[PDB]
Amino acid sequence: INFYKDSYAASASKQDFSQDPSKFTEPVVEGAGAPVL
């Protein structure tokens, strides 16, 4: 875990598996195979 008193001294944090690609791939307001226009 961590034997130091300061939490920032701890080892790496490799458990953040959440993600939201859409903020980069689909930043459009109006959200299938229908014409995008």
Partner 1 sequence: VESIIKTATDTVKSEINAELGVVPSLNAVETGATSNTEPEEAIQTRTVINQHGVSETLVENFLGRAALVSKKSFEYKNHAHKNFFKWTINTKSFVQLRRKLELFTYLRFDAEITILTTVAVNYMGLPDLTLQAMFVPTGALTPKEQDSFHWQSGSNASVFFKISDPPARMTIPFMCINSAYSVFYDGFAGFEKNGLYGITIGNLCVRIVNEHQPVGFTVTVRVYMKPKHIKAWAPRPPRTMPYMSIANANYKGRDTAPNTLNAIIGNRASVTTMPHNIVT
Partner 2 sequence: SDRVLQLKLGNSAIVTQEAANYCCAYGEWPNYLPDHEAVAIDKPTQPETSTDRFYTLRSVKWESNSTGWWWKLPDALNNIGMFGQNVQYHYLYRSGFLIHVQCNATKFHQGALLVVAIPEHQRGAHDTTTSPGFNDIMKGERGGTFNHPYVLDDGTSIACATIFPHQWINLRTNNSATIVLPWMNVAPMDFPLRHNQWTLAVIPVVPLGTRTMSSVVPITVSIAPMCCEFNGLRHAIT
Q: Which residues bind partner 2 (CB under 8 A)?
A: 20, 22-24, 26-30, 33, 35-37
Distance CA(30)–CA(12), nearest Å, equals 38
We find the least distance from the C-beta atom of residue 4 to partner 2, in angstroms, to be: 27
Distance CA(20)–CA(37), nearest Å, equals 24
Compute how many other C-beta atoms are within 10 angstroms of the C-beta atom of residue 27: 7
**Taking CB under 8 A as the rule, does residue 23 contact a copy of itself?**
no
Q: Which is nearer to a copy of itself, 2 or 22 (CB)?
A: 2
Binding residues (CB under 8 A) for a copy of itself: these are: 5, 11-12, 14
